[PDB]
Design an enzyme around this catalytic site. Structure first.
Site, PDB file in Angstrom:
ATOM      1  N   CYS A   1      13.687   3.778 -18.946  1.00 53.48           N
ATOM      2  CA  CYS A   1      12.427   3.384 -18.287  1.00 53.48           C
ATOM      3  C   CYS A   1      11.925   2.009 -18.710  1.00 53.48           C
ATOM      4  CB  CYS A   1      11.317   4.423 -18.516  1.00 53.48           C
ATOM      5  SG  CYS A   1      10.672   4.476 -20.243  1.00 53.48           S
TER       6      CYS A   1
ATOM      7  N   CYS B   1      13.869   7.593 -24.358  1.00 52.91           N
ATOM      8  CA  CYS B   1      12.601   7.984 -24.994  1.00 52.91           C
ATOM      9  C   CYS B   1      12.311   9.479 -24.756  1.00 52.91           C
ATOM     10  CB  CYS B   1      11.436   7.112 -24.477  1.00 52.91           C
ATOM     11  SG  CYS B   1      10.866   7.513 -22.778  1.00 52.91           S
TER      12      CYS B   1
ATOM     13  N   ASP C   1     -16.232 -12.933  31.242  1.00 41.77           N
ATOM     14  CA  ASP C   1     -15.965 -14.377  31.329  1.00 41.77           C
ATOM     15  C   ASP C   1     -17.103 -15.193  30.731  1.00 41.77           C
ATOM     16  OD1 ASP C   1     -14.440 -14.082  34.653  1.00 41.77           O
ATOM     17  OD2 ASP C   1     -13.669 -13.605  32.649  1.00 41.77           O
TER      18      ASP C   1
HETATM   19 CL   LIG Z   1     -14.389 -10.624  37.689  1.00 43.76          CL
HETATM   20 ZN   LIG Z   2      11.879   6.284 -21.127  1.00 43.33          ZN
END
Ligand SMILES: [Cl-]
Ligand SMILES: [Zn+2]
Ligand SMILES: [Cl-]
Ligand SMILES: [Cl-]
Ligand SMILES: [Cl-]
Length: 467
Positions: free
Chosen positions: A61, A22, A283
């Site tokens: 492409c 192209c 904790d």
């Molecule tokens: Cl602790």
């Molecule tokens: Zn192309």
């Protein structure tokens, strides 16, 4: 408009055209670095090309620089994007081509290189404009006009298009039968770099042949990068883990600090998931008081990202109105820096605690007084027995910066202490069977145990405190 190609470009241009390439791919192979010639209508390009030379799926492409780089297709991508309902102020455009495209590009290169040799001219492989580069030159302004936002390479909003060409997929397989120690587009690229020319030419047509159809659009997708909310949390429960504690699909405890904060946020940000992070942890039976502990929540693929300060404040009040077990302060939108700041705090910054301490022997106020005078006490702390299953056995040197006592009764006192990051407080009080040396028991000549522990401060300045 005035044609980009010179009389020198004629031979290559004619040969490529004749064999099915192209006009835009012809520009790439003639090294046209000017963007504007590529943006002209396909019909005007083909007609100007013909006129120049005398003065239908592209075999290179496969339609990428034909119908797929034009306004009508970009409009249909943008309509898909608009239906997704994201908020965004810019975009990055990601595009993926069939891995087999590189094989055709390579064949065209060899053809052009051969023709260039006829005319005693030199051509470098890097002289060819990349398909993706030209593709973005053409499409970037089209996305920008359609969506009304700039293209920004650092945008958190990504539009992605994936192309496929099922007809030619076996080319990837054909290449693995020549150099097996090499698909991705990149692994095909790597293979083509190392392949002997005669071996390439044995397997693959040169020039590449024009196919029956253009590429299929496999995927058109969009996504927003994560946004972050940060703050500090207080924790008032002694029966709440920081993160979900699930043992067998069974909950060991109900909820978590993480969930009490975050389970409001996904509906707000229209996000699909969250990752909770914090500067340290305590904790389940430990409260966190004072200013609280820094945390951040990463919200994944948010469809809503624009929030004023007032709307974030309102979010914080919603969280706070929903629980007595935690509270949040300093809630604010932040960037990915969050993770770094909190990690540094965890590793480097002091913390401050209050402990209610029991003693086996009857003590008087005067028996704990000496603790107030001890500064920067060096302790040798073996990995606590209670965490030997998670972390390796090691002796850490830790520092108790200061201690302040409040006598309670003959078998209790409160200890306020500031410690180096990573210090295990419970083990410092009771001694962990002598695995933490010095400890409160040894220093006092009693057996000591810790009844209650509270984090009084996490000495990490980040995220900025709010008014
Ligand atoms: Cl602790
Ligand atoms: Zn192309
Ligand atoms: Cl890309
Ligand atoms: Cl911590
Ligand atoms: Cl509650």
């Amino acid at each position: 408009g005035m044609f980009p190609l010179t009389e020198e470009n004629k031979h290559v241009a004619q040969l490529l055209l004749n064999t099915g390439t192209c006009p835009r791919c012809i520009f790439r192979f003639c090294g046209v670095d000017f963007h504007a010639p590529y943006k002209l209508p396909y019909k005007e390009l083909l007609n100007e090309l013909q006129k120049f030379l005398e003065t239908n799926v592209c075999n290179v492409c496969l339609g990428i620089l034909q119908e797929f780089c034009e306004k009508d297709f970009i409009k249909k991508v943008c309509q898909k994007v608009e239906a997704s309902g994201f908020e965004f102020t810019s975009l990055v455009f990601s595009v993926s081509f069939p891995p087999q495209l590189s094989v055709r590009e390579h064949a065209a290169w060899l053809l052009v290189k051969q023709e260039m040799g006829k005319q005693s001219l030199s051509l470098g492989r890097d002289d060819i404009v990349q398909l993706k580069e030209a593709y973005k030159w053409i499409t970037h302004p089209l996305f920008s006009e359609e969506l009304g936002v700039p293209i920004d390479g650092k945008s958190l909003f990504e539009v992605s298009v994936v192309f496929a060409h099922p007809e030619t997929v076996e080319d990837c397989h054909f290449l693995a039968a020549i150099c097996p120690d090499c698909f991705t587009r990149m692994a095909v690229m790597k293979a083509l770099n190392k392949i002997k020319e005669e071996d390439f030419l044995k397997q693959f047509p040169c020039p590449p042949n024009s196919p029956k159809a253009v590429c299929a659009v496999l995927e058109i997708e969009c996504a927003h990068g994560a946004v972050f909310v940060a703050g500090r949390y207080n924790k008032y429960s002694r029966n709440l883990p920081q993160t979900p504690w699930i043992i067998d699909g069974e909950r060991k405890l109900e909820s978590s600090v993480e969930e009490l904060i975050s389970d409001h946020l996904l509906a707000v940000f229209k996000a699909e998931s969250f990752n909770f992070s914090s500067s340290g942890r305590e904790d389940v039976d430990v409260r966190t008081l004072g200013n609280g502990r820094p945390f951040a929540i990463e919200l994944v693929n948010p469809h809503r990202v624009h929030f004023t300060s007032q709307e974030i404040k309102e979010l914080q009040q919603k969280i706070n109105n929903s629980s007595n077990k935690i509270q949040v302060r300093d809630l604010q939108l932040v960037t990915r820096e969050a993770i770094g700041h909190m990690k540094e705090g965890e590793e480097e910054k002091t913390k401050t605690y209050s402990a209610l301490i029991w003693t086996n022997k009857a003590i008087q106020k005067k028996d704990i007084e000496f603790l107030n005078d001890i500064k920067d006490l060096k302790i040798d702390q073996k990995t606590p027995l209670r965490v030997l299953h998670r972390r390796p056995l090691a002796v850490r040197a830790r520092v108790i910066h200061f201690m302040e006592t409040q006598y309670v009764d003959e078998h209790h006192f409160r200890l306020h202490l500031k410690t180096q990051a990573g210090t295990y407080i419970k083990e410092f009080v009771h001694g962990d069977f002598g695995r933490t040396k010095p400890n409160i028991g040894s220093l006092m000549n009693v057996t000591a145990d810790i009844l209650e522990l509270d984090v009084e401060s996490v000495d990490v300045d980040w995220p900025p405190a709010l008014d």
